[PDB]
Amino acid sequence: MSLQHEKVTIAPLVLLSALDHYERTQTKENKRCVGVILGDANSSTIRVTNSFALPFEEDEKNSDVWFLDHNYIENMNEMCKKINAKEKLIGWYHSGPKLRASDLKINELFKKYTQNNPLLLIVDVKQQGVGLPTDAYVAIEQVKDDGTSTEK
Amino acid sequence: GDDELDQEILNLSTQELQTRAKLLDNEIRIFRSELQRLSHENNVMLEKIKDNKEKIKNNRQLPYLVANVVEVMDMNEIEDKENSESTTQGGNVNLDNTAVGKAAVVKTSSRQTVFLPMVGLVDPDKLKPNDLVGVNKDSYLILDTLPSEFDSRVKAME
Amino acid sequence: EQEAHNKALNQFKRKLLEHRRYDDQLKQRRQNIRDLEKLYDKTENDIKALQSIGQLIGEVMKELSEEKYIVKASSGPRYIVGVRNSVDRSKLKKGVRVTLDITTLTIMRILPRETDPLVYNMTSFEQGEITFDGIGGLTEQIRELREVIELPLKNPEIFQRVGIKPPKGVLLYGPPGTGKTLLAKAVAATIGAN
Amino acid sequence: EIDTILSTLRMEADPSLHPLFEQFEKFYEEKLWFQLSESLTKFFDDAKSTPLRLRLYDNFVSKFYDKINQLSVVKYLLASLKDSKDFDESLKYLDDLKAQFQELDSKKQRNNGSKDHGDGILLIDSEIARTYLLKNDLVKARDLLDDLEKTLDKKDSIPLRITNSFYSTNSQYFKFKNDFNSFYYTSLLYLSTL
Amino acid sequence: MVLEATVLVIDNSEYSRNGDFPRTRFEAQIDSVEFIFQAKRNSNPENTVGLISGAGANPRVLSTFTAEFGKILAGLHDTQIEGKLHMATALQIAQLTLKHRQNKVQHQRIVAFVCSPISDSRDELIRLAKTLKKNNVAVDIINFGEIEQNTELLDEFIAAVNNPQEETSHLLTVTPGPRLLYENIASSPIILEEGSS
Amino acid sequence: TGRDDTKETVYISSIALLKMLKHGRAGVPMEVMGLMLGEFVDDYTVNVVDVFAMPQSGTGVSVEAVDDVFQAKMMDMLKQTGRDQMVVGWYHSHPGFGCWLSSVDVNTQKSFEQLNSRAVAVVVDPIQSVKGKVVIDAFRLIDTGALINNLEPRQTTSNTGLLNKANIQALIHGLNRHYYSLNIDYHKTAKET
Ligand SMILES: Nc1ncnc2c1ncn2[C@@H]1O[C@H](COP(=O)(O)OP(=O)(O)OP(=O)(O)O)[C@@H](O)[C@H]1O
């Protein structure tokens, strides 16, 4: 759709929250957590106000196999709409630790809900490095000089 | 009917009309799926109407301030990519970032003026730049329109 | 009947009616969802409005530093306020109505000037309208009026050749009922100046 | 049926290209239209220089258009008119298919619940501009091109086929005018998205 | 039986826009999903059925278990018909789907429609079939795609799962020729499906 | 008698304090409301884990502005992910007054006490947190019948004896003599630090 994710400003609340969800589903041993990010978009700064957990069970045989409830997402969104109505789907968080290429397929699913281009916010739960524990990424489509067609 | 009658005994053979009827059984099967779908969708929809409007109905009941409207000065409506205001701001890419929709400035009888984003249910056809409005006293949003004020001695003329 | 197998086509005429009424019902319920949509959008904009809070107006009274500003709020008592990055120093200047927040007390954005609620009545009563000519035979006094008023409006450049101050200021006075008040409605109508 | 039209093409071709047509008709009877798509592809690779290709496809548009895959039909139509030495004719076919989708997706989209006809529309618009570049009305071609370019970037995720055809039109224009520089960048996108 | 939670796996191919059932095979399947759903509810209402698709090119859940048919139908509307079901990924996601429910009183049943020629390696799918018997899950394979032009690999898996169990797998063979897909699955056991205990 | 019978020291989590503040601040000047979710251990240690807000009203805080539907549903969302606990009390905002329950809230606190007797009310000032110091205080009712039975010294047994106050006259009379105060401390792990 667009690129307008030049800056991502992220509330400290969200980080705190992400660690809290991660432990209370007790995803350890290379298990992941996905939740929705709620917040503003159509701004060059993307504002991450809030997050909420989605139930997501991620497999150990493959990384290509996952369960995620689509029915759940809307219910969560409409209750939060009642609180403050400036909150809309702006992506989903991955609990890291690191980027995956099975996240690309999940990105495309969140692209339905959005009216912006999905933010994948790898919120590390490992607190690695003395700098930020967040790297941010957005799935964008390109051709490239190599002879590489339609790359995501 | 313009098919399958005594018009078509003349026009076509009646075993072709025997097989026609068993294809209208096939097409009303497809259509029957499609009607039940659209009922179900309207069952989800009516309760999303109910959800919004109950909120408005708490705000609607008593008490609420009574004020006049300074002016409607508006701001460009929300549909743009860079801002949606009439007055130029610093920086690029906005639409809800500090950008705001139409504006109504209202003057209280508590003696102040408040720049509020006007209620999207109350029109500009229901605002005149002197109109006597309700304002919700807890958080300043134009609640309703009411008719122009009259002093008690003018009520006593009638 | 023609046929005795037209007894079976009564049953097929019967389905035919059904099939064409189900076509009509699919396009009915899509026009009924289109009506429950405008009513849902009508109430959804109110939800976005109810959750918005107000703002309190000031004006820039005086630059204090770079990031601190003296505003005189329309509460009445002066405050000292902050800036978002939404505004600039050079978009703020004295006598600009600026908005404030009601709990952060920061300029978020520049607003156009305030305009009293009284004075919009004065701009929207001119009614009693008539042409150039109001009352006749006193045309000579109509033409004198536009010497002061209409003539410097169209061309200030003819009052430049003379080197006089551009004419202004009129006192109309006289016995009552004599179209002094009508003439006033006619020089607003005819010229069509503010 | 189709056998009689088909027979004429079978006579004129090589003996060793004779069996290929029989298999196309074999699938049609059985009502496997995925398998017909695959069968059709084969002829086109090694014999689109034939006028037999053209013929074949004309009969196919008439008896298949919701039967074989929609996309396969329009891709054929790009190929077909490169083989037609007639331009007037080219315009006629592009506009018949374009018109045909407009009425069709009203019925088509709701009944299946899916299958977008606007992908066909772009493939169609690309070929119209292409036709005006081969007739050498360069003002006309260019102006359809600017309009088309706005339209592509609006569509979020572009199939490689659509954007490939766009980039072909863009190449053809720029070496006719002999702007070497404009050609170079556009052909790097062409070779990529192949 | 009853007290049964069923996951429907709908195949989405281009072998399903082919003339094999009036008006098409995709349209036939729509009637079938609903016929299944009503038969389980009408017997006992503590039966819910949900729908996954093979739309995209990795299976997505349209709808979880529900008692509302209107839900299943709305989500079937939302489809991609150029997608491709992969069997091996769909059995694993369905097993997970089955482990996401509101009550675990319900028997474990998958009804997976197969409408394409299967072209997934045999050797893997032996292992996935024996994984099902140790979770107490049965799988009802409706074949009408693989008979048409392909080897009968799915038959051997069915035999593998069969052991003394509450719900035990079944092989139903549905003709591919026109004979109305919806009528034929209704007459086949779908509510009179037995264990093997 | 037979227990510690003293008001819990509310230990508010790193997540929670920020979340009540963001949720109170957006709605200033209008009064805000919501639930505190937490767990009850000891006899006098409640750790409040997380919060959720109960939607706005047009008459602001009321007992009435509790809606069972919002409360229970939102609860079933968190259940599916297993981050739900039990309602240990509630928060609400007076930004127009100091820390102390208003006449309405004491009656809301009586209903809440009834359900669970460890129910706290935490009054958040989002408008006096424009300082370097956040103004936040906790209260829990001591029953009218309770004062008569003179059970007030029972509640201040086994504590440091350090309490909080807010202004004088009216505010202070409500605080000490009708409700009971207990300090608020901040809880955190080394991961969050
Ligand atoms: N010259 C005229 N010809 C026709 N009608 C006139 C004329 N002058 C005045 N009238 C009529 O008299 C009405 C009232 O007089 P108007 O208010 O214009 O006058 P005025 O000289 O300023 O005195 P006052 O202010 O006391 O009314 C007008 O609305 C119009 O119908």
Ligand SMILES: [Mg+2]
């Ligand atoms: Mg007068």
